[PDB]
Design a protein around this ligand. Structure first.
Ligand SMILES: *[C@@H]1O[C@H](CO[C@@H]2O[C@@H](C)[C@@H](O)[C@@H](O)[C@@H]2O)[C@@H](O[C@@H]2O[C@H](CO)[C@@H](O)[C@H](O)[C@H]2NC(C)=O)[C@H](O)[C@H]1NC(C)=O
Ligand SMILES: *[C@@H]1O[C@H](CO)[C@@H](O[C@@H]2O[C@H](CO)[C@@H](O)[C@H](O)[C@H]2NC(C)=O)[C@H](O)[C@H]1NC(C)=O
Ligand SMILES: *[C@@H]1O[C@H](CO)[C@@H](O)[C@H](O)[C@H]1NC(C)=O
Ligand SMILES: *[C@@H]1O[C@H](CO)[C@@H](O)[C@H](O)[C@H]1NC(C)=O
Ligand SMILES: *[C@@H]1O[C@H](CO)[C@@H](O)[C@H](O)[C@H]1NC(C)=O
Lengths: 126, 202, 194
């Protein structure tokens, strides 16, 4: 494992540190339905889920609080999600990976779960 | 047919933060800023293209600073150098494979204790940046009147500090210092030297 | 209510889960049951090797085959004298690792004043983080610098008229897991004289 997987982890550690106003919103849980898909499909799928999220919530009123601080936290949340998306996507190398599922999840648990999947992946290679 | 020509493959580096600088050489005297346009675009779905206006670097040399919102290892860019309607050159560039770190700053000298001399500086990157925790340094210390005798200390730990035993510093004179940085994890080159700092120790 | 279990994975070789026995209104043997959540192999397990302190159940001990980091871990502290008096608990083992102290520290010259310290670890090269510590026989306190997983420190300025001593410890953080605790300091090592 080279730097790509490492960046993904740091960003995750960073994101799981403090939760923001919109970390409660839900997203498709793609882990609770692991249908023995490839390692790639997962990365790609996770990228898709996150992409949809920042895509839909970037300019969300609820998320941008009432204080500058809530505002910056949200901007940053969005920033990091983009970093995750592009790295995870680069890692998979798939043009498309349909996320057909219905098991919802809180982004907070999604990131927390994903962080574990990534740290384990890292602990493997040497 | 092709009045304007790029002599050699253009070369770029990134500070891995906001900027990427490409350098290249033209076949003759050229007004870069007037004749050329470099269009870069991230290779990622639904991403727009950007236009950079080249600065001049010597009579037939050009340089251009591509501004980026963020940078991650996966990211790759398309580059298209135009001279009007004539594509001069086309290429790809992956920031994470050609990193040159920003020079460190705020080099200050501490002389409270007598045994050792303490040197501190600042790490140019924000803590949230992927390079922050990967930099190690090199401090350069020389005498003003006796530049001949200069030393280069290698700081191979994360803290931006250096301690040198004063038992190696001819008192009475004034020395100058400056520091640069690199990140082994990304196989980067050295940063530029930081502004220097002279001090007269006793 | 009963004591709280405190598991700690050692160098990812074996885990130790203990509790203070002097908190019970009477002597007893609390049983330990463990299982992993929402993964393969959900079935509950019995502590296959109990630990004893003052002729009482001190804790449990599981071997490598039984340790699964990156998989929600769930311990159960039961009391035979009460089938309904117990507490269930879930852990993230990955954050409870504690590597062995680094060993085989070396000290050689790479140049005229480049003094490089080296050392090796126990099967977790890229998961470790290190804290190097040094001083002279005159210093009243150590000075510490952190490598990340480098295991290669280097003092850029060495004084010949001084005896140096070095030591390091490792930590399983932050890429493979967020373990708070360091390992025990490695045996010291010396250089030069005076
Ligand atoms: C790290 O980079 C070096 C140097 O490559 C070039 O120099 C950089 C500073 C940059 O300016 C670019 O022009 C180039 O990328 C790489 O050098 C090679 O090292 C390998 C051994 O690892 C050796 O087999 C090759 O002969 C070297 N190539 C050349 C042209 O000399 C080096 O590979 C990079 N190190 C790692 C860890 O990837
Ligand atoms: C020199 O040091 C000062 C610290 O006083 C730096 O200024 C701070 O920079 C950080 C990160 O860029 C900001 O978050 C702070 O708000 C700035 N001011 C504060 C509160 O200190 C400055 O960037 C340093 N310069 C160099 C060369 O790194
Ligand atoms: C695990 O328990 C045994 C027996 O009590 C003890 O000797 C050992 O040191 C413990 N593990 C640790 C703390 O490394
Ligand atoms: C507990 O177990 C120990 C060791 O098996 C045994 O000596 C003792 O009789 C048991 N009963 C209690 C509650 O002490
Ligand atoms: C040095 O330490 C290693 C542990 O990685 C050990 O296996 C080795 O035997 C030690 N060196 C010797 C030969 O004493």
């Amino acid at each position: 494992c080279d730097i790509t997987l490492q960046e993904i982890i740091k960003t995750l550690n960073s994101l799981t540190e403090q939760k923001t106003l919109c970390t409660e919103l839900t997203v498709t849980d793609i882990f609770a339905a692991s249908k023995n898909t490839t390692e790639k499909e997962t990365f790609c799928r996770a990228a898709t889920v996150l992409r949809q999220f920042y895509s839909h919530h970037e300019k969300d009123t609820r998320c941008l609080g009432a204080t500058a601080q809530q505002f910056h936290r949200h901007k940053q949340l969005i920033r990091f999600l983009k970093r995750l998306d592009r790295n995870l996507w680069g890692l998979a190398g798939l043009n498309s990976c349909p996320v057909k599922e219905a098991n919802q999840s809180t982004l907070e648990n999604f990131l927390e779960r994903l962080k574990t999947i990534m740290r384990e992946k890292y602990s493997k290679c040497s | 047919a092709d009045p304007f020509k790029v002599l050699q493959e253009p070369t770029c580096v990134s500070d891995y933060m906001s900027i990427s600088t490409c350098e290249w050489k033209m076949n003759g005297p050229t007004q870069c800023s007037t004749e050329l346009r470099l269009l870069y675009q991230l290779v990622f779905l639904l991403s727009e293209a950007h236009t950079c206006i080249p600065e001049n670097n010597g009579g037939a040399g050009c340089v251009c600073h591509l501004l980026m919102d963020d940078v991650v290892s996966a990211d790759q860019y398309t580059l298209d150098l135009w001279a009007g309607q004539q594509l001069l050159w086309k290429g790809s560039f992956k920031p994470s494979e050609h990193v040159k770190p920003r020079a460190p700053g705020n080099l200050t000298v501490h002389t409270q204790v007598s045994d050792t001399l303490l040197l501190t500086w600042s790490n140019p990157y924000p803590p949230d940046n992927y390079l922050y925790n990967h930099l190690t340094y090199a401090v350069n210390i020389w005498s003003e009147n006796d530049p001949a005798d200069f030393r280069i200390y290698q700081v191979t730990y994360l803290e931006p500090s250096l301690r040198i035993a004063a038992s190696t510093l001819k008192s009475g004179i004034s020395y100058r210092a400056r520091v640069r940085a690199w990140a082994q994890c990304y196989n980067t080159t050295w940063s530029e030297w930081s502004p220097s700092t002279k001090w007269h120790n006793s | 209510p009963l004591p709280e279990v405190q598991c700690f994975v050692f160098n990812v070789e074996y885990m130790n889960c203990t509790w203070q026995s002097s908190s019970e209104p009477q002597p007893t043997n609390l049983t330990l049951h463990y299982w992993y959540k929402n993964s393969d192999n959900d079935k509950v397990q019995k502590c296959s090797h109990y630990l004893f302190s003052e002729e009482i159940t001190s804790g449990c001990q599981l071997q490598k085959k039984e340790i699964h980091l990156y998989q929600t871990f769930v311990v159960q502290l039961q009391d035979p004298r009460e089938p309904r008096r117990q507490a269930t608990q879930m852990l993230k083992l990955q954050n409870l690792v504690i590597p062995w102290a680094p060993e085989n520290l070396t000290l050689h010259k790479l140049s005229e004043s480049q003094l490089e310290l080296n050392w090796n670890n126990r099967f977790l090269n890229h998961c470790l983080e290190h804290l190097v510590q040094y001083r002279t026989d005159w210093d009243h306190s150590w000075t510490e610098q952190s490598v990340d997983y480098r295991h290669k420190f280097s003092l850029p300025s060495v004084d010949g008229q001084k005896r140096y001593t070095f030591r390091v410890r490792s930590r399983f953080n932050p890429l493979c897991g967020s373990a708070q605790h360091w390992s025990e300091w490695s045996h010291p090592i010396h250089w030069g004289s005076n």
